[PDB]
Amino acid sequence: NVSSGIIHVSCSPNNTIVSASDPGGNVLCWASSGTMGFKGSRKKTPYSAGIAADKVAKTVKEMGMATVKLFVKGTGRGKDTAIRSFANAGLSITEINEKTPIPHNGCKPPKRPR
Amino acid sequence: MRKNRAPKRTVLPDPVFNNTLVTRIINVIMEDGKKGLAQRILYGAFDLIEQRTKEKPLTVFERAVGNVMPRLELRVRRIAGSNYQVPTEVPQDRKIALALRWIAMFARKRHEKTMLEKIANEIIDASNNTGAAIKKKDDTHKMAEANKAFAHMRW
Amino acid sequence: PKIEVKNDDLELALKKFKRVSLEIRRLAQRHEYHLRKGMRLREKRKIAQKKRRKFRNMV
RNA sequence: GGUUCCAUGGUGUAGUGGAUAACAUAUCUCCCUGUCACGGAGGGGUUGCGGGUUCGAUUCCCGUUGGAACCGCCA
RNA sequence: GGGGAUGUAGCUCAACUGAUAGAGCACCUGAUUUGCACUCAGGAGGUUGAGGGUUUGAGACCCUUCAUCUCCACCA
RNA sequence: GGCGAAGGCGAAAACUUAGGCCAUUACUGACGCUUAGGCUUGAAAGUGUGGGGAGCAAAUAGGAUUAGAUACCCUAGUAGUCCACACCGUAAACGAUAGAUACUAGCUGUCGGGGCGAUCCCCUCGGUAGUGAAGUUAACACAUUAAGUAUCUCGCCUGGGUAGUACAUUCGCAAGAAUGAAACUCAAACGGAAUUGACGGGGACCCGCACAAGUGGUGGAGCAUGUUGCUUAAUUCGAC
RNA sequence: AUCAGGACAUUAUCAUGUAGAGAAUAGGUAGGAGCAAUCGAUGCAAGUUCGCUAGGACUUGUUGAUGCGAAAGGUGGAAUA
């Protein structure tokens, strides 16, 4: 019922999440590899990110929006498969801003696995 | 480690219906190195097909074999545990060859009588997409569709 | 890191966004695992030397 | 001196309200490897003694051994 | 004693207030392993407790029994 | 790349404050180098008292893996990591190279002051790097910032294991620090550098029925033959 | 004392609504067997009803002089003014 809005696409190294939201807060719908039915290790594969983007794009397109600002997030591997999925869905991508949290040397990160 | 691609021997046009593919399936059902025996068996099945389906045997054979032909092939690739499979497009030559091998393999296991009627029933049962070779093709296709994610990584 | 699409084409936006994300991914991965201060300085000097030596022969 | 518990394969333990005995380790044969350990397949091996009841006792009953756990106080 | 429940496959439980006999795990075969498992495909396994009636039809709706589960009172 | 003697120092500002480089027609007029003893500082961990605690994580609990896992992986998680005041005084505290002084080819960078005046670039005086001959070294290599030619002063070394152990002593609340042997034992040493091979669950490249793609088999049954074991008077001997 | 909210009762509100078969959403009974016409035909447009996504009834707009085989015709357990 709204023309413009925001779709946050977080890409963790282990999973991915695509949240379609109002231009300010108030998410309208959300989807993830887990809710699709994919389980375990497969949830971290670029193909799954594209699949998740496709379902949320179809759902949100029937709701009737055109202009999308795409706030890319995370540091996974399928960060662009979802991007191409939305473009092939045909929504009007207006911005490609990236907002992955970067620290300015605050908080000590965890130990190195070996 | 070879760097050379093997040559290919001629396939030969069939001597009756002039459909190369007949010679290939003859060689597939070959056992004990009997060319004679295999031709007789196979040719007898087309005659049974005439008596039953009232249609041209070559057309029925193509409709059965062409329907059985698969599209995706799953190649095993182990890394650490088990194998993650990889769907790849099989060439045209191997497509017919794999189809013929399955046709013969499920034909020599049917509950029917003399392999003439055995092999005759399998081909007629495969022209209507309801048989044993069909199920094998269905299973590999579904397995490839399930393992669509790893298709991008081959080696 | 906002980049406008310009609404003239789509690829170009992703052609610029690829660069921006790579330099972005570098610092994002740096603040993921804890190294000592000496090792952190060690890794900084290592990156600088690699970039320097590559630029010498590209200049 | 008295009272309660236990005795099952080579070793550690389950069951059976009478008709039936398994688990693990161990043992044997075969894959496995240069070989061996580990691994895989298959194979095998059982009611403390006695005496009664029942058509039938490892099980139910009374005695006899061995090993434990409890008590043996008031002067 | 009084009320409320249940009985559907080998093991648990859905159904659906009347028109499907199902889901899951156990058992079996196939793909797949160094194995052990996880995964993926297929398959079976039922007087729907018994008895009577409803309805054009039932496992279901109702009535009555059998069995177990709960409860919820108790000066011989 | 800069600064400090070393440890160390990187958001911004104020106050206090240390040393250093260049030019000196100025001044004192050998007042200089080193330093046993002594004093000061000294990463992180650790200690005592009082605050603080977001994140992380020794110890600890659980889930995995595994023949076993008190470990590598994951989920939690206290002391601690932080501040103030008191201690501890050890590190691969390394340029594995004590400080000071004079001399000895050159080339390429870079930083600061000074001279010229768009930068850029040239010269002078210094700091920090790379390459490089004489020279030195067992070799690797050092080479004007020496491990070169020489002098002064201090510290330290005298085969390996015992052993940085034991006793005594000083310091410390504590863990400990400093100092530091011997009996006994070996002919060498987890000695140094370099060379030829082998090997690597190190890379790069190339081959073969090796894998892959197929076909027909073997391991299951009966039989033939050979072998192991056992037996027997002998089951002749060898091949493993 | 007042306000707001949903509990559960309603004053009062009538479409709903989906065996097959039947042409049909069949909610059960229309008493029955033709009936409605400014007590206004018929027409198609918009929304809504709920869904058994086929269909349903209702409202709004066109709106004017014959519609109503849901009277009579239909099959069915259930039925046609």
Ligand SMILES: [Mg+2]
């Ligand atoms: Mg981590």
Ligand SMILES: [Mg+2]
């Ligand atoms: Mg063998």
Ligand SMILES: [Mg+2]
């Ligand atoms: Mg006493």
Ligand SMILES: [Mg+2]
């Ligand atoms: Mg500290």
Ligand SMILES: [Mg+2]
């Ligand atoms: Mg533990």
Ligand SMILES: [Mg+2]
């Ligand atoms: Mg954690």
Ligand SMILES: [Mg+2]
């Ligand atoms: Mg502590």
Ligand SMILES: [Mg+2]
């Ligand atoms: Mg020292």
Ligand SMILES: [Mg+2]
């Ligand atoms: Mg040199």
Ligand SMILES: [Mg+2]
């Ligand atoms: Mg000595």
Ligand SMILES: [Mg+2]
């Ligand atoms: Mg000493």
Ligand SMILES: [Mg+2]
């Ligand atoms: Mg030693």
Ligand SMILES: [Mg+2]
């Ligand atoms: Mg060597």
Ligand SMILES: [Mg+2]
């Ligand atoms: Mg092969």
Ligand SMILES: [Mg+2]
């Ligand atoms: Mg054999």
Ligand SMILES: [Mg+2]
């Ligand atoms: Mg055998």
